Write a protein that binds this DNA or RNA. Sequence first.
RNA 1: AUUGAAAGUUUUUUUUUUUUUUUUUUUUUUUUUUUUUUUUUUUUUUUU
Length: 125
Amino acid sequence: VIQVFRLNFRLRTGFRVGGGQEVGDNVIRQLRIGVEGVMIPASSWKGMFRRVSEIVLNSEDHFEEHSKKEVDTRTINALLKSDEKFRRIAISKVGKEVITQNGINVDKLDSESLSDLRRIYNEYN
RNA sequence: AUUGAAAGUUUUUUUUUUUUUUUUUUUUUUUUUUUUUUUUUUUUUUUU
């Protein structure tokens, strides 16, 4: 399912999204385009929306970069064997040889691969 | 029917924070509301 939105905002007074602002300090220059004039970059929109969503959710897990607890490898294996898309993501990232169809291949695993898998689990959750 | 092929240069990151166009600056200094004009003229304290 795809949800499409066309949001409009009745901002009080004005806004300003600068960039570069040349050198020599003095005035503050809002970012230009050259042809279209001025715009708000999509990255700024995404950052503002992420901030608002983080405020809304108020998740303690998200506050500490999802690095506050140790995730058991058994749980990781259970999710991997239970979620096909998660398994596909893990295989596409850490490598097909490292992660087989069924199992984690602990012998080939090392510190950084394990950390990557734990971070992927935390962020996917 | 190319020696021969099939892969998105992709994900991810808010150009943001610090700063009161502020202090000082009395719409006042001068100019007599005076100036020419008689409250005046007419009338018997009185008759059969």
